[PDB]
Design a protein around this ligand. Structure first.
Ligand SMILES: COc1ncccc1CC(=O)N1CCC[C@H](C(N)=O)C1
Ligand SMILES: [Zn+2]
Length: 139
C-alpha cells in the first residue's frame, strides 16, 4: 500500500483503490495502473518534473529505502493477476531491485521530488508507474 498526496488529490495504484477513491474519482487509467481521487485537505508532496533515471524507492517488504537506476517510461508486458488480464502497461519504468505484491504504493523519489509509485515486480526487477507527465496534479 501507499499513496501520493498533492494538493487536493490522492494518487494510488488503480488495483488497490478503495470505494472512497471510486466515489471521489477524478481520473483513472487501467493501462497505467493509476487512479486519482479528491481529498478535502491540501497535501504537500512535490511532484518531480524531470527526465531523471536515478532515485530512491521505499520497499515495505524490507522496511528499507533503495537507490536505483531506472528505465525511461514505456509499454512493458505484464503477466496476468486477479486484478488484470495479461497486457501491456504503459508509462512503466523498471529497475534492478526487490519487491513483493504488497510493495505496490511505495514512492520512488529523485532529487526533484516524487517520480512515481511501485506498480509491478518479479525476477529481481521492480516496475514504477511514472507520474511526472501528469502536469494537472499541480494546477
Ligand atoms: C510489486 O509487485 C510485485 N512484485 C513482485 C512480485 C509480484 C508483484 C505483483 C505484480 O507485479 N502485480 C500484481 C498487482 C498488479 C500489478 C500490475 N500493475 O499489473 C502486477
Ligand atoms: Zn528532475
Amino acid at each position: 500500500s501507499g499513496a501520493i498526496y498533492v494538493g487536493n488529490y490522492r494518487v494510488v495504484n488503480r488495483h488497490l483503490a478503495t470505494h472512497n477513491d471510486w466515489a471521489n474519482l477524478v481520473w483513472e487509467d487501467s493501462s497505467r495502473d493509476l487512479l486519482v481521487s479528491s481529498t478535502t485537505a491540501q497535501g504537500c508532496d512535490t511532484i518531480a518534473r524531470c527526465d531523471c533515471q536515478t532515485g530512491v524507492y521505499y520497499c515495505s517488504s524490507r522496511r528499507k529505502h533503495y537507490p536505483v537506476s531506472f528505465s525511461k517510461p514505456s509499454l512493458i508486458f505484464v503477466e496476468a493477476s486477479e486484478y488484470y488480464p495479461a497486457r501491456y502497461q504503459s508509462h512503466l519504468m523498471l529497475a534492478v531491485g526487490h519487491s513483493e505484491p504488497g510493495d505496490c504504493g511505495g514512492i520512488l523519489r529523485c532529487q526533484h521530488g516524487v517520480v512515481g509509485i511501485v506498480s509491478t515486480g518479479g525476477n529481481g526487477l521492480v516496475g514504477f508507474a511514472d507520474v511526472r507527465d501528469l502536469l494537472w496534479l499541480d494546477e
